[PDB]
């Protein structure tokens, strides 16, 4: 108990409220807990738009575990249990049940089709599904709607006009200045990667290999290298 005991011997010992020795002696005789491959404070709170990331200085509750490199995390399927993708290699392509979240797919034409209707026709009915998809894209990428000045125009304009598809609009949102300002600037580097992974792809990271692939890109190209590498994965094209 070298590391645990020398934390207790320090004069910051009373500032730690989470018990450490009973947890440590229990960890020695049990399998690996499931958390981030890095420290246990590296996985953010799973709320709509928080990105909490407990500080490890405001109130130390540091918890480590030798995770290695080939340990593949166990994730719960937010939907039908038999589509976990670990016992069903093609599970994201079979149906969509009521057990999971609503899936937005811009099947409406968009395109600015026009018609054999009035030249300056007032109603035109459904162009509120493009508007419905636009406000839903923010709800996924940022977790909430932005303020008035922060909304990215001249990409929603292209999406409405049909010049670009949803995959290109999502790329414009993810590579935006506001997304970097919110979820890249004020966070530790490996925390920002883990949170951005959940926003751009619907799941947390699986492996130390998966985390390191984005880490060694962030150290060479920065935020744009991470976001571009995430959006250009085979998994994104296969699933979404």
């Amino acid at each position: 108990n070298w590391g645990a005991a020398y934390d207790l011997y320090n004069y910051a010992a009373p500032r730690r409220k989470v018990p450490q020795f009973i947890t440590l002696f229990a960890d020695y005789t049990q399998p690996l807990p499931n958390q981030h491959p890095y420290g246990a404070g590296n996985d953010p709170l799973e709320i709509q738009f928080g990105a909490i990331f407990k500080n490890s200085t405001i109130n130390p509750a540091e918890r480590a575990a030798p995770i290695g490199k080939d340990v593949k995390r166990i994730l719960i399927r937010n939907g039908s249990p038999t589509s976990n993708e670990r016992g069903n290699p093609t599970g994201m392509s079979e149906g969509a049940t009521t057990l999971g979240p609503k899936i937005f797919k811009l099947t409406q034409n968009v395109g600015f089709r026009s018609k054999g209707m009035v030249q300056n026709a007032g109603v035109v009915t459904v162009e509120g599904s493009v508007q419905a998809l636009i406000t839903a894209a923010y709800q996924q990428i940022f977790g909430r709607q932005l303020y008035q000045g922060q909304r990215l125009k001249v990409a929603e304009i292209k999406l409405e006009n049909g010049e670009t598809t949803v995959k290109e609009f999502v790329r414009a949102l993810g590579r935006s200045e506001i997304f970097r300002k919110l979820y890249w600037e004020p966070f530790y580097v490996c925390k920002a990667i883990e949170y951005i992974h959940r926003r751009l792809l619907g799941r947390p990271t699986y492996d130390r290999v998966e985390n390191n692939r984005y880490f060694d890109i962030a150290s060479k190209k920065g935020f744009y290298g991470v976001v571009d590498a995430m959006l250009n994965s085979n998994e994104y094209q296969e699933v979404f």
Partner: protein, 68 residues
């Protein structure tokens, strides 16, 4: 900052989708220069056909002013 005007047709053979895949199979879209490689390779590996490609944003031989 260059873009690409790309028209492509992607047929999905083994899936058989139940509802409205005109907008997914055949489409024209704008793509940035730095992502045209990945987008083209995505189209090729799915058996799609790249009907047309246009520059639409840049100049043919710019040494400068083409920064991302």
């Amino acid at each position: 900052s260059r873009y690409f005007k790309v028209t492509a047709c992607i047929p999905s053979l083994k899936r058989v989708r139940t509802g409205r895949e005109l907008q997914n199979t055949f489409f024209t879209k704008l793509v940035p220069y730095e992502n045209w490689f990945t987008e083209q390779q995505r189209i090729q590996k799915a058996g799609g056909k790249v009907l047309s490609v246009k520059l639409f944003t840049g100049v043919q031989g710019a040494n400068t002013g083409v920064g991302a």
